[PDB]
């Protein structure tokens, strides 16, 4: 349920917003994983 | 407070349909157009159902709206969100028709806002469409239509 | 002066067309000022040249910020105009 | 939905190009947890105990004994929802503005929906980062005309009941005086049992420039930055100390631990910019769109942040 | 209000153990015996941490306790339940030692209750065991031990 | 390139590396990279300057 997944087909705007939020969370996780400090 | 905080003791009787709108909880206007300009401002005090005026601080914080009138009148407060402390203001340029607080009056009387944002008989600001209705000991409301400022 | 009809908020030089908000509608934005003698909480009047000057004000215009200079004579000030006085 | 709405498809296809916020570096991965809210409050209760008087000696017969009192504190975090509106070109009207290189009217400062949304989202993320850092919201360099915010909405710099040090105007360039103030603040810091945690420092570029000067006669292979790192390692059980430079800060030094038990960021899952479904259409080529973002959710324990302000007046 | 209704913005630091009892929310006494006599009465106003006196209505309703003192003193209020409006009273016959409201003083001073249920320097009622501690602009507390009435 | 920061080390202090570094620090202070300051930097020096370094 993320915009990164090309298989995602948003039925409605609410699902689009939820996918946006999940994509933001996944991007945060990816950034923290890639960070080395 | 627009919504009575004190809980009611009894269930209301939803059988009648007359004289169920003369309450302080009624927010907005009796007749509302979809092309009405609405703004939100920080609320200083409780300006609900009163004329509001712009007040500027020392510059550190942005402007706010406070209950007032006279030459400083900016608009009419028709609603308020208490959680965010936000007052809904219809600008004096836009015309309004609804129930507003009246100073503790007959239809056809010309009413102007005083220093406390309360309507009073006489520049005029509105025309009374009804008589004063008493909700609390000092709380009086009146149906008035506001059409801006005109001498 | 007393002849004010509105304020021009947009312009298109190719068609020589000015987009204008009527005086009956309130506005909040940056306008040209006569000089840099304007402070916050100041009553402003449009002059014969259409510039805002510090104060017999037919309209009710109040400055929100101070005059900001960009060019030799360009003075932009944030002003809210909300109708006419009485 | 994408077949019916072009704006949603454009947002989905251009959302990747938006950079991550820089505030993520300021916190550990475990310090940030998302909450499901748009406007409201989240409250928690903490229980503390205290001693009422000196202990009673148990000798012979006695009925009156000293008591232990208890207290509860309710801590509330408020959230606020804000919106911005921007103008752009219509999808059908794009083809009449698609030049060879650029797309959009240069004279009228009009852009396609995708580019306008990208730039607006970038600006909103910058504002969000500034709010997270300083605790205030404003668009003026002077810092005036700030937006009045709800209580219990605080940032790392304006958080109350924290250690606050002020370097006088006369000692604005004396790094020795600045480090004296920093040492006093570090002494007044109270980490308790959570001392064994990494520490984070945020400094302005001028402070970073002053840090690299040799420690003071001038020392050899010893600089103010190294001395500060050693001083912080003294109190953090020799844990990692990170130093960051932020252009948002100005003559301010911020020191705080990176432990979730002391400072935690619980932002709304809708804090980051999100497009709105409402689109203002007309007979012309100009349309309007809205972006929503949520602010609030920083929770910190008392007396766990050092805030040094160097008075430049 | 014994418990601050306004919510705190920050978590407290539970590291220290000294001077964490000088708060208005502290209810009861510092030293409490298991053989103490405790009563509950309807509360007239807010007599928390104040001397109380018996007040009788017109006979329709039962007696209540009101903040007071002098020759009408009946006991000392050490706790209050706001939901039920019930004040906990320790009778003047029983001795009490704890923090009480002080009129806005050194250890060893003899203190008597005034008309508003506040302790004041000089019949004596209690002896100050410490100095006045300021909680608010007009709120002062003092650790005192009450041993009844004696001239 | 115009509109860039230019510093001049005086003739008398041509051999004074402390003066050279003072001028370099002044130029670095006058640099304005905006929010893109978190980027790698590149320096080009003449062989005599490298030997002095």
State the maximum Cα–Cα separation within chain E, in Å, rounded to a whole number. Answer: 54
Nearest-by-Cβ selection for B59 from D40, D145, D150: D145
Optimal mutation site among B74, B89, B96, interface C, most CBs of chain C within 10 A: B74
C32 burial type by CB count under 10 A (0-12 exposed, 13-18 middle, 19+ buried): middle
Q: What is the DSSP string of chain D?
A: -TTT-HHHHHHHHHGGGSPPPGGGGGS-GGGB--B--SSEEEEEEEEEEEE-SPPPP--SS--EEE-EEEEEEEEEEEEEEEEEEEEEE-TGGGGGTB-SS-BS-TTTT---HHHHHHHHHHHHHHHHHHHHHHS---S-TT--SBPP--TT---TTT-SSSEEEEE-STTSS-HHHHHHHHHHHHHH---GGG-SS-EEEEE-HHHHHHHTSBP----SS-BHHHHHHHHHHHHTTS--EEEEE-SS-SSEEEEEE--TTTEEE--BTT-S-EE-S--B--SSSEEEEEEEEEE--EEEBTT--EEEEE---
Q: Which residue's structure tokens are 């009374």? A: B128
Angstrom distance (rounded) from CA D265 to CA D29: 10
Q: Identify each DSSP E strand in chain B by its residue range.
A: 39-44, 51-55, 64-67, 75-81, 86-91, 96-101, 110-113, 119-121, 124-128, 133-134, 140-150
Contacts 24+ apart (CB under 8 A), E3-9: E3/D72, E7/D43, E7/D74, E7/D75, E7/D76, E7/D152, E8/D73, E8/D74, E8/D75, E8/D76, E9/D75, E9/D76, E9/D151, E9/D152, E9/D154, E9/D160
Structure-determination technique: cryo-EM
Under DSSP, the state recorded for F3 is S
Judged by CB atoms closer than 8 Å, whether chains meet at E30 and D161 is answered as: no
Optimal mutation site among A17, A23, A34, A35, interface D, most CBs of chain D within 10 A: A17
Angstrom distance (rounded) from CA D294 to CA D37: 9
Rg of chain A over Cα atoms, rounded to whole angstroms, equals 12
Resolution (A): 3.3
Angstrom distance (rounded) from CA E96 to CA E22: 18
- Cα A15 vs. chain centroid, distance in angstroms? 12
Which residues does B45 contact at the CB level (< 8 Å), separation at least 6? B66, B67
Nearest chain D CA: its distance from E26 CA (Å): 7
Q: Which residue's structure tokens are 């153990």? A: E17
For C10, the closest chain D residue by CA position comes to D108
**What CA dihedral angle connects D166, D172, D173 and D176, to 10 degrees?**
-30
Chain D residues whose CB is inside 8 A of the F35 CB are 126, 247
Q: Is B34 on the interface with D (CB under 8 A)?
A: no
Q: What tokens were used for B79?
A: 């609603």
With beta carbons less than 8 A apart as the criterion, state whether D64 and E31 touch: yes
Q: Is C40 on the interface with B (CB under 8 A)?
A: yes
F–D contact (≥3 CB pairs within 8 Å)?
Answer: yes
Picking from E135, E138, E127, the residue whose alpha carbon sits closest to that of residue E104 is E138
**E70-94: b or e for each residue (b if 16 or more CB lie within 10 Å)?**
eeebbbbbbbbeeeeebbbbbebeb
Strand partners, B150: B124
**D41-77: b or e for each residue (b if 16 or more CB lie within 10 Å)?**
ebeeeeeeebbbbeeeeeeeeeebeebebebebebeb
Judged by CB atoms closer than 8 Å, whether chains meet at E15 and D190 is answered as: yes
Chain D residues whose CB is inside 8 A of the E11 CB are 46, 73, 75, 299-302
With beta carbons less than 8 A apart as the criterion, state whether D182 and B76 touch: no
Angstrom distance (rounded) from CA A20 to CA A7: 14
Angstrom distance (rounded) from CA D128 to CA D297: 12
Picking from D223, D196, D191, the residue whose alpha carbon sits closest to that of residue D305 is D191
Q: Is A6 on the interface with D (CB under 8 A)?
A: no
Optimal mutation site among C65, C77, C80, interface D, most CBs of chain D within 10 A: C65
Angstrom distance (rounded) from CA A13 to CA D285: 24
Q: What tokens were used for D121?
A: 């989202």
- CA distances to B60, B138, E120 from D142, rounded to whole Å, are 9, 46, 53
Angstrom distance (rounded) from CA D37 to CA B86: 19
Judged by CB atoms closer than 8 Å, whether chains meet at D146 and B61 is answered as: yes
Angstrom distance (rounded) from CA B106 to CA B8: 33
Picking from B22, B2, B15, B9, the residue whose alpha carbon sits closest to that of residue B135 is B22
Chain D residues whose CB is inside 8 A of the A7 CB are none
For D144, the closest chain C residue by CA position comes to C65
Angstrom distance (rounded) from CA A16 to CA A3: 8
Angstrom distance (rounded) from CA B129 to CA E30: 66
Q: Which residue's structure tokens are 């979809």? A: B34
Chain C residues whose CB is inside 8 A of the D145 CB are 64-65
Chain C residues whose CB is inside 8 A of the B71 CB are 85
Angstrom distance (rounded) from CA B97 to CA B33: 11
Q: What is the DSSP string of D64-109?
A: EEE-EEEEEEEEEEEEEEEEEEEEEE-TGGGGGTB-SS-BS-TTTT
Strand partners, B113: B119
Under DSSP, the state recorded for E7 is P
D–B contact (≥3 CB pairs within 8 Å)?
Answer: yes
Q: Pairing between strand B64-67 and B39-44? A: parallel
Q: Is F28 on the interface with D (CB under 8 A)?
A: yes
Angstrom distance (rounded) from CA D59 to CA D212: 65
Within 10 A of D2 (CB to CB), how many other CB atoms are there?
15
């Amino acid at each position: 349920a993320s915009l990164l997944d090309s298989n995602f087909v948003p039925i409605n705007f609410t699902e689009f917003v939820q996918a946006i939020s999940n994509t933001y969370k996944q991007r945060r996780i990816q950034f923290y994983e890639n960070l080395k400090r | 407070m627009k919504n009575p905080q004190q809980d009611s003791g009894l269930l209301s009787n939803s059988i009648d349909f007359r004289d169920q709108n003369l309450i302080f909880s009624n927010s907005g206007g009796v007749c509302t157009s979809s092309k009405d300009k609405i703004e939100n401002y920080p609320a200083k005090g409780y300006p609900y159902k009163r004329g509001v005026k712009l007040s500027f601080g020392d510059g550190t914080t942005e402007l706010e709206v406070e209950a007032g009138g006279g030459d400083d009148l900016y608009g009419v407060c028709s609603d308020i969100d208490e959680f965010s402390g936000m007052a809904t203001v219809i600008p004096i340029t836009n015309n309004f028709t609804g129930y507003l607080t009246l100073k503790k009056v007959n239809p056809g009387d010309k009413l102007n806002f005083n220093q406390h944002g309360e309507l009073e008989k006489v520049s005029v600001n509105a025309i009374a469409l009804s008589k004063a209705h008493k909700l609390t000991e000092d709380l009086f409301i009146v149906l008035a239509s506001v059409f801006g400022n005109r001498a | 002066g007393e002849d004010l009809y509105g304020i021009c908020i947009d312009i298109d030089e190719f068609s020589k067309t000015a987009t204008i908000v009527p005086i009956t509608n309130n506005f909040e934005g940056y306008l040209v000022a006569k000089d840099s003698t304007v402070k916050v909480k100041d009553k402003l009047i449009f002059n014969k040249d259409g510039a805002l000057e510090k104060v017999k004000a037919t309209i009710n215009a109040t400055a929100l910020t101070d005059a900001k200079q960009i060019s030799n004579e360009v003075y932009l000030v944030k002003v809210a105009v909300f109708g006419n006085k009485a | 939905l994408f077949d019916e709405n072009y704006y949603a498809k454009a947002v989905a296809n251009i959302i990747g190009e938006v950079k991550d916020p820089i505030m993520y570096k300021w916190f550990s991965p475990d310090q940030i947890e998302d909450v499901d809210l748009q406007m409201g409050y989240q409250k928690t209760v903490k229980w503390d105990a205290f001693l009422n008087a000196n202990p009673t000696t148990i000798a012979n017969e006695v009925n009156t004994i000293s008591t232990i009192g208890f207290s509860s504190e309710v801590v509330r975090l408020n959230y606020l929802k804000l919106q911005y509106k921007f103008r752009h070109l219509k999808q059908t009207s794009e083809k009449f503005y698609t030049s060879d290189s650029y797309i959009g009217d240069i004279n009228n400062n009009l852009l396609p929906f995708a580019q306008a949304y990208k730039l607006a989202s970038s600006e909103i993320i910058k504002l969000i980062n500034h709010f997270v850092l300083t605790g205030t919201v404003s668009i003026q360099k002077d810092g005036k005309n700030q937006k009045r915010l709800l209580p219990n909405m605080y940032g790392l710099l304006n958080m109350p009941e924290q250690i606050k040090e002020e370097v006088a105007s006369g000692d604005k360039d004396k790094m020795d005086k600045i480090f004296e103030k920093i040492e006093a603040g570090l002494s007044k810091l109270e980490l308790g049992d959570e001392f064994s945690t990494p520490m984070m420092v945020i400094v302005d570029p001028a402070t970073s420039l002053k840090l690299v000067k040799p420690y003071a006669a001038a020392s050899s292979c010893e600089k103010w930055e190294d001395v500060l790192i050693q001083t912080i390692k003294a109190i953090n059980n020799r844990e990692d100390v990170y130093i960051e430079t932020s252009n948002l800060l100005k003559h301010k030094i911020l020191i705080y631990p990176l432990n979730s038990e002391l400072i935690k960021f619980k932002p709304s899952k809708y804090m980051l910019p999100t497009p709105n479904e409402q689109v203002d259409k007309d007979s012309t080529d100009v349309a309007h769109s809205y972006i929503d973002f949520v602010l609030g959710g920083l929770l910190a324990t008392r007396k766990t942040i050092l805030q040094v302000n160097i008075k430049q007046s």
